[PDB]
Ligand binder design. Structure first.
Ligand SMILES: [Mg+2]
Ligand SMILES: [Mg+2]
Lengths: 336, 336
């Protein structure tokens, strides 16, 4: 039995993505009950990604899980779920996450264990230093520069260099940058990458628009830093085409339809010699913990979504010594 | 605690591969015990594949699993096992199979369930009609045709057409052919595929030598039947290079190091738009059942290895209505 309801996330501070800022995030919480056991799922919908409370609720209303007598047949169930519409990946991810939580609970094990991973190999998660006045930047950098091992900075703006210089003036932590399709000029992108490398940046994400794949490959082939694809891909079927253009791929549950496809993407990327990183949207600990289950296999992780909201409903993965830390709870590892 | 010992397989009848006939098959049985639970593994060594009792025993003697306190860390354990030598894939597969059996038993579930597959989607397994005099061929065909839904014929000989005609004169069952790199001329191979198609053959396996991948792609691109690669690949790292040249790939545990890599190969092939089939060597029900755990994901299956030996040590997957049939036993699904 699947039930679901809207649960708007309240952000602690203004959150900015490219040219979009917000203080809330539409979200739908999902639950799947089977023989007294309940699996928790979630759909998070950053406005610019094209899904809404209406689209997600409408999609979930099309899903009939009652006709399935065995929660363990995830291949069949999720194939059916995917067939209900061409996209709606966040809505589909919510069903996938709840099903994995349910199945893990039925098996009495966390997915990192079912997948055969070593939880001690979880990565450090980045935490973002937001754009603001040089004084506010140095302040916030200092405030969190003590809990994390790596910092994230979103570039592609107008004061990128000043921002990096400001941050680097009060901390020596490595920095991961996400240009989010911000650099349209190929030479600028490469020149900036070399400058960032000199400033201690250790990874760059989506330097240019996804439409300029040839330019991206040109940059990556000469880049001293690993270049990860984000906006350039969404699902499993988008991975292969990026080989040779990117060093690795970024996987997000809300973009790929959940844990099952996410794990297939990790397998595919690796089998193809590409690296993998995992990201997130502003989410409750439900989706964050779910994604964390395969973090022992990634090179980089931006899994701080729940720290950005003031109304988390679950206690799941925690950040210890700046490291994503999985508990021993079965399923996706959360307690309501 | 891992223990192992030689267990030569006794074949029910002379078994031939190309021009090589034999009546026995070197094999090593493996057992991994953990807190009172035992996982069963197996390595099968057809002589022409490069491994021997000596090589397998010597490899296994190098494996130290006692240093690992958690059998669930398959990623780490099998990475370590693979690092011990360049090849020895059958010896490595034995460790992998025993570990999966153990983990499945500890979880209380069979791997087809852990992987999220529907056991009702298991395929029909082929059974081979051996090359012999027309009288023997007709007799042997009539004797087994009633138990199987599809028959296998090993072509690439000097009497291929007569063989197919002889068999087709007593049965209307679909036939899967394995040319075993027997056809050196792409034109001859293509014409043969067209001829076989009219004769009710539904699939072609390794039509030409692996050294002639260019000619193979030429034939496959204009073939009316799916063409599967066998000798053209061994492990996960060999799959991608076959895209566009083959319709699908054939996976065998003794060639790919076991279940974990096999499952990754299924993911990779499918993600790349390729089909998958699974095969086997003459083996006990241990290795046959292990491979059967992912059979619900394959298009074709040649999983009759245990039926060819007279000294099977386990009761596992069975053939019912010509279909591979998985039981509900945990791990790889066998009873000693
Ligand atoms: Mg990004
Ligand atoms: Mg073959």
């Amino acid at each position: 039995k699947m039930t679901f309801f809207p649960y708007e996330l309240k952000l602690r501070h203004v959150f900015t993505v490219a040219t979009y800022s917000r203080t809330t995030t539409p979200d739908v919480q999902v639950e799947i009950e089977y023989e007294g056991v309940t699996g928790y799922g979630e759909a998070s919908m950053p406005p610019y990604l094209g899904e809404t409370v209406e689209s997600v609720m409408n999609f979930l209303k099309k899903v009939n899980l009652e006709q399935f007598s065995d929660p363990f047949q995830l291949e069949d169930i999720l194939s059916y779920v995917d067939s209900l519409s061409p996209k709606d990946t966040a809505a589909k991810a919510a069903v996938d996450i709840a099903l994995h939580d349910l199945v893990g609970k039925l098996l009495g094990a966390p997915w990192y264990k079912i997948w055969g991973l070593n939880k001690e190999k979880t990565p450090s998660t980045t935490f973002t230093i937001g754009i603001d006045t040089p004084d506010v930047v140095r302040a916030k950098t200092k405030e969190c520069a003590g809990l994390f091992n790596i910092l994230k900075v979103k570039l592609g703006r107008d004061n990128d260099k000043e921002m990096i210089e400001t941050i680097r003036s009060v901390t020596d932590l490595p920095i991961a940058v996400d240009a989010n399709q911000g650099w349209k000029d190929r030479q600028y992108a490469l020149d900036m990458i070399h400058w960032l490398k000199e400033k201690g940046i250790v990874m760059i994400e989506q330097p240019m628009p996804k439409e300029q794949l040839d330019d991206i490959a040109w940059v990556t082939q000469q880049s001293p830093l690993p270049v990860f694809a984000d906006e350039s891909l969404q699902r499993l079927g988008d991975v292969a085409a990026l080989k040779g253009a990117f060093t690795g791929i970024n996987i997000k549950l809300m973009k790929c339809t959940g844990m099952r496809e996410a794990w297939k993407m990790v397998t595919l990327a690796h089998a193809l010699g590409m690296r993998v990183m995992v990201g997130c949207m502003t989410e409750t600990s439900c989706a964050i913990s779910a994604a964390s289950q395969f973090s022992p296999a990634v090179d980089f992780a931006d899994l701080d979504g729940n720290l950005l909201i003031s109304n988390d409903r679950f206690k799941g993965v925690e950040v210890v010594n700046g490291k994503i830390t999985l508990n021993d709870l079965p399923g996706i590892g959360v307690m309501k």
